[PDB]
Each structure stands twice: as C-alpha cells, then as structure tokens.
Amino acid sequence: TEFRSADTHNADDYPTVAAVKYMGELLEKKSGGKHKIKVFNKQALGSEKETIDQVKIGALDFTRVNVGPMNAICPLTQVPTMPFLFSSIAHMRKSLDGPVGDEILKSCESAGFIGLAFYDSGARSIYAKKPIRTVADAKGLKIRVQQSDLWVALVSAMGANATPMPYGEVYTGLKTGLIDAAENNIPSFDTAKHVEAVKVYSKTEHSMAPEILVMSKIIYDKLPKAEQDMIRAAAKESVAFERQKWDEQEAKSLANVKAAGAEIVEVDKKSFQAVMGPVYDKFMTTPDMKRLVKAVQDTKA
Numbered sequence: 001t002e003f004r005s006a007d008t009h010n011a012d013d014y015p016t017v018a019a020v021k022y023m024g025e026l027l028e029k030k031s032g033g034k035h036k037i038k039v040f041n042k043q044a045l046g047s048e049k050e051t052i053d054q055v056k057i058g059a060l061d062f063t064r065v066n067v068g069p070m071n072a073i074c075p076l077t078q079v080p081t082m083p084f085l086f087s088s089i090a091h092m093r094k095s096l097d098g099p100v101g102d103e104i105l106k107s108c109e110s111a112g113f114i115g116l117a118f119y120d121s122g123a124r125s126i127y128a129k130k131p132i133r134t135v136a137d138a139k140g141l142k143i144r145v146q147q148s149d150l151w152v153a154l155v156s157a158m159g160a161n162a163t164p165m166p167y168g169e170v171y172t173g174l175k176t177g178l179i180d181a182a183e184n185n186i187p188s189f190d191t192a193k194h195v196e197a198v199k200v201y202s203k204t205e206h207s208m209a210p211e212i213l214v215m216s217k218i219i220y221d222k223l224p225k226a227e228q229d230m231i232r233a234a235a236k237e238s239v240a241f242e243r244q245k246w247d248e249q250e251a252k253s254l255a256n257v258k259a260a261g262a263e264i265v266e267v268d269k270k271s272f273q274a275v276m277g278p279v280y281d282k283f284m285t286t287p288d289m290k291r292l293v294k295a296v297q298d299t300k301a
C-alpha cells in the first residue's frame, strides 16, 4: 500500500523529511515493492498537534513530530524532553538507541501509537531580540514554547512568560511582536526564517527533546506480522541516515544564520540548570519516569 506520513517542516530536504523518505525506500525494498511511503511536509496534513490526532484515529498512517506535543498523550516522551537530562548529543543518541528509548517507544501503544524511531533534533536554545545569558535575563521574556504543560513549566522555571503555540505561527508572531522570543535548534531557527525576525541566539541548550516517528496502531494492527516487522526495521535503519543528514544541516544552517547576522551568544548554562530541580519534582512523578531518568544518567560514556 501507499502509506502517508506528515512533517511540519517546509523544506523538502529537511533531515526529518529526507529520513522518512529514506525509510520509505527501505520499506519498498524489504516488502518487495509492496509498501511505499509518501511524505507530506509543509504541514500539508495539519499542525503537529492535528496530525497526532489524525494518526490516533487511523486517518493518517504516520506522523513525524517532536516529543513536545506527545508529552501528554504518551507521557514517557516527557523523559527525553527534560531539561539538561543528557550531558551531550552522544549521550542522547546512546540513550535513545538503547533500552531507554525502546521502552519509551513501546509505551505509546497504550495511547494508540506505535513508536518506531527517535530522530535527532540537536539542542534547543533561546532566540530573541536581546541576549539571555543568565536566568535573570530571561525573567519576564515573552517566549513561545511547544504545546505541552511540561514545556510551559520548563521555560517558566527560568522566570520567562512561556506561551504555547503551534510551530507554524511562530514566524509571524516574532515578526509582528506578538511574541518576543522562541527556542529551538539552529536548523529550525534558520529554515523557519525565525532568524529574519530575531537575531540573538543564546545557547542555553535547555532541552534535547528528540523527534519521534509514530504509526497509527489502528493501521499497524491490520497488517501481517511480517510486514509490521518490515516497518519497524525500516524505521530503525533510517535513524543513522537522519543523523548524518542532521549533522550536515547543523553546519549548513549555522553558516546561514551567521552570514545573515545572527549573534550567537555563549551562556552560563549552570544558571539555567540550577533552576530545574522543581521541574523534575513536578513532572517526573511515576516509578517508570524516575527509573528511566536514572537509567539515562547511569549511562556510561
């Protein structure tokens, strides 16, 4: 069959878009030409939030979204959203590739989603019209976050005025002054044109919230077991491809924003990490959550 998958990013060569297309090619091979995937980027099938609900009801086969908007519906996705959980990108990758990531993916089935893969999204940092070098600078900042209570709390802990909005509204919000800041990785800041509106990128690196690729359980459950396995394998094998493309995009977008006049500011990251204890207290509240946070931070370099 020809499955459909959604992506919010406009660029046809964005790493997450390229990665699901690659998955589709692997799936065609593994299935002897039976199954294919068509990727609808440019949020053609809806915002992230909208596509998650379409997948839930079986109207959309796959969606590639950030863990952020999955935080309430698949609560263990909150774990890798947590601020300063991972010590580095390498640590994130090892954690998500291993039993921690796999447990989180499997946990989404109770909510109607087959978790298939985590894709790299770098580290997220604040961008604004002024530098944010300490949490004191963040106090009162009118900043957009993704649509989850955890995300609101995470940035609120910095003293900022966190405002949940869908991604597609961010560019205009920054241009018109409806919001004064947002936060994201460099490729997003670049490709969504946020850099056109605000130039100061303060490297708070306050989350490494990865992407998650989910399939509709309703659709998955109707396929033969052997074909379910093909889909799982194609997804898993696409992660290495996504990561290589992601590394390349990080470099390209950094060059782009620097050339466009972005001011990249180094910060006292401990200023920001020092305020996050209560976010763990308020959100990492179940035994599974506590065990997974510990498992991540027990992971050896």
Ligand SMILES: O=C(O)[C@H]1O[C@@H](O)[C@H](O)[C@@H](O)[C@@H]1O
Pocket: 008, 048, 064, 065, 066, 121, 146, 166, 167, 183, 184, 185, 188, 211
């Ligand atoms: O901030 C956001 O909403 C966006 O952040 C980007 O990093 C994710 O790639 C994209 O999936 C999210 O929709």
